Amino acid sequence: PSAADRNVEIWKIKKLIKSLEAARGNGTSMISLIIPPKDQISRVAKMLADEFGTASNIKSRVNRLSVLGAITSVQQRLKLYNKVPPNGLVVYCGTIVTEEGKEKKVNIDFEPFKPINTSLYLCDNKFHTEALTALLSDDSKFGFIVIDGSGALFGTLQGNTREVLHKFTVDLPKKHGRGGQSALRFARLRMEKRHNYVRKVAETAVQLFISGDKVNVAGLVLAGSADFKTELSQSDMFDQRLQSKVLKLVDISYGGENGFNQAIELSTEVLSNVKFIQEKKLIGRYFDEISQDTGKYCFGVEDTLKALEMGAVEILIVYENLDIMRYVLHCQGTEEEKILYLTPEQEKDKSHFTDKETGQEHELIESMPLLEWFANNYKKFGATLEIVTDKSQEGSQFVKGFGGIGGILRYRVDFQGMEYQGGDDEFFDLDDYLEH
């Protein structure tokens, strides 16, 4: 957990994904390997050796060469490291085709950030970036509490990554005491005392959840048996404003990386559901503002860039599937530089770059996507960047008018764009000139 250092890793990952997708390999020449942490190398190596034997049996005399080369290449890199480093390793090997019929060979190994037990090895015509994108996802990990009579274990789950933080054990007074009699329910009193310790333990677990007056995980899930967790969940000290956040309580038996794991799996599907309703709560708030007719909320692709420059927008909303990117255009005269936002249809015809309705003359030299730009620069703007999907009806509503981007203002501002959107000076060509 290091500031900015994590971001650098993210940068390399996104760059890698774009390059991996661009390159296409014929046949079975493309090999992708992901090695999880605390996973023995020898099992992996043996698996690679077994794969090598299979290729020989193929008898292709063409395909076999390509398959053997890929296998041998990955093995050489594997040989260099005696024991696997924490957070695992990712290795890509194979043969790819580049511009002008040139052959390009690739050997990349690096230490991935926070990927546990991916166990992915595939033979295919292209590299798989799905594991890489998991790291990139907006949600911030899952926090799990597994509670049992004989002990308590704490850990976190991110994507398909399993983490164990810390565990401890306490004991309830199990032996009643046949020989000594108090006869009166001193034991009940003892139980009551036990009850307070269970409460305190709850209180301590909660303390773990929040550090630095902040919460470690977006969602926290607790599990247990004999209703210790249900009781555990509702108490004044235990909630710490986090009680509302927890969705499912799951009854478990024989907990100890057994049955306890099952509780985690069911809770996660629901936790994803809370995000859907969390967005909905935002939505209800959004509609109330609409009723108000303040006009504080803005819309339009160009409006958002302008909104950030102003710095008046508290919340920035973007979609992963963004159909709008930033393109720089050269005038026929060559004396003037032009900036415009283009739809995928417009983006595809790079050489003409002309709108049918007006006959506009545009030439495209270099393009910079808006999604990557907004995420990198939101901090200087002061706005908060949030990512949402169009699955929700409200998301669809944004699509009909505003588009792939959304914006929220701290204070009511008229802004610029279409007349419904704001001021009439919707577009400008000033930015292109600075670059050139």
Next chain:
RNA sequence: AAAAAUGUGAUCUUGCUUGUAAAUACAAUUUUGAGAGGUUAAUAAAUUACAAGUAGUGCUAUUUUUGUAUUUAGGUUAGCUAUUUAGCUUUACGUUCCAGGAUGCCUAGUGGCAGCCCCACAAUAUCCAGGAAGCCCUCUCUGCGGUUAUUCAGAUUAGGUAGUCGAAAAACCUAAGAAAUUUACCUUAAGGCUUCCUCGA
């Protein structure tokens, strides 16, 4: 050394046994491979002096004379072996090397030899046959050499895993196996397939 003899009762000074004092090479060969603790154990003779007993002698014990001088010297501690002739150990009797002292006897001559104490006649037993080196067994180096946790990293294999071999090796040690190899098992998803009627200036 041989001889008057009062004597001490005429007599002798005790080879014997008993108690006291001191002689009777070291090293090598074997044996622990070595150094070496256990050279473990056990337990050995004789010559001279004193007392007792007495085997001796009467304990103690005395005189004259003779003799340069009877001084000797040499050797024995001979053994074993063979029917006989004769052969023939530095003495082992764990193994092995080396003393050999006492008694008394034979060489004081005779034959050979210049001569002799030499060879023969060499001579009878004969106390100890002693001393020395060597610990059939315990620790160290480990003499068999081994025997090990293993890491390997390799070798060897078509290659893999194991074994074997090698290597870096935790450790341990132990009374000369005089040691031996055949070593396996694992994996191959589809492999490529045609013959019709000139007998052409």
